[PDB]
Amino acid sequence: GCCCNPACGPNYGCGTSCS
């Protein structure tokens, strides 16, 4: 779903609801 890891890009902004 929502990006969390750094590999994804410069910013992921992982959210608690969208972990």
Swiss-Prot record:
**Record note on modification:** The disulfide bond Cys-52-Cys-68 (Cys I-VI), which corresponds to an extra disulfide bond when compared to the cysteine framework I (CC-C-C), does contribute to conotoxin SII stability and imparts a unique binding mode at the nAChR.
What tissues is it present in? Expressed by the venom duct.
Q: Which cysteines are joined by disulfide bonds?
A: 2-18, 3-8, 4-14
Where does it localize?
Secreted
Domain remark text: The cysteine framework is II (CCC-C-C-C).
Give the family, as the similarity comment puts it: Belongs to the conotoxin A superfamily.
Task: Briefly state the protein's biological role.
Answer: Alpha-conotoxins act on postsynaptic membranes, they bind to the nicotinic acetylcholine receptors (nAChR) and thus inhibit them. This toxin potently inhibits the rodent muscle nAChR (IC(50)=120 nM (adult subtype, alpha-1-beta-1-delta-epsilon/CHRNA1-CHRNB1-CHRND-CHRNE) and IC(50)=370 nM (fetal subtype, alpha-1-beta-1-gamma-delta/CHRNA1-CHRNB1-CHRNG-CHRND)) and weakly inhibits neuronal nAChRs.
Leftover remarks: Negative results: shows no or weak inhibition on neuronal nAChR alpha-3-beta-2/CHRNA3-CHRNB2, alpha-3-beta-4/CHRNA3-CHRNB4, alpha-4-beta-2/CHRNA4-CHRNB2, alpha-4-beta-4/CHRNA4-CHRNB4, alpha-7/CHRNA7, alpha-9-alpha-10/CHRNA9-CHRNA10. Has no effect on the release of catecholamines evoked by nicotine.
Recorded protein name is Alpha-conotoxin SII
